[PDB]
């Protein structure tokens, strides 16, 4: 059997991952799985950032003015 992984997040998303000696192969497969996971999570972050406007600035902008 191959190494596998399953991911779950509260926005309703479920994601399955599936990708010389037996153990040698095992280790390369884990390296490939690790890249899949990293690729997938990075993509999730890239879309979460794109879903914002610029309101990091604007958020702090109010806190300052409220101080003044």
């Amino acid at each position: 059997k191959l190494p596998v992984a399953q991911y779950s997040a509260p926005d309703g998303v479920e994601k399955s991952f599936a990708p010389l000696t037996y153990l040698g192969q095992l280790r390369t497969q884990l390296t490939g799985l690790q890249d899949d996971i990293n690729e997938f999570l990075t993509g999730r972050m890239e879309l979460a950032k794109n879903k914002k406007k610029a309101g990091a600035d604007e958020k702090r902008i109010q806190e300052e003015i409220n101080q003044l």
Binding site: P3, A5, A9, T21, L23, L26, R27, Q34, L41
Partner: protein, 84 residues
Amino acid sequence: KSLDHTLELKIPFETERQATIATKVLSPDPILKPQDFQVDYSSEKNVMLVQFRSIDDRVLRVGVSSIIDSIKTIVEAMDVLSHH
């Protein structure tokens, strides 16, 4: 405050002993707050089970990759030992 981004990793070794040992030798000490990131691991028969829980994807990415590195190291070592 919620650990609801989860990932489970399942790693099939050749024997029940190899997985038991893997588990014993895996000693995660993350740099991440326990409030943000948690890892549980165990074995069943020849399979190692590692369950991550995290508050978000950023924390998860950092935590999972690092532990996977440890696991690979343990697989390399076992590869060396079983072939002599």
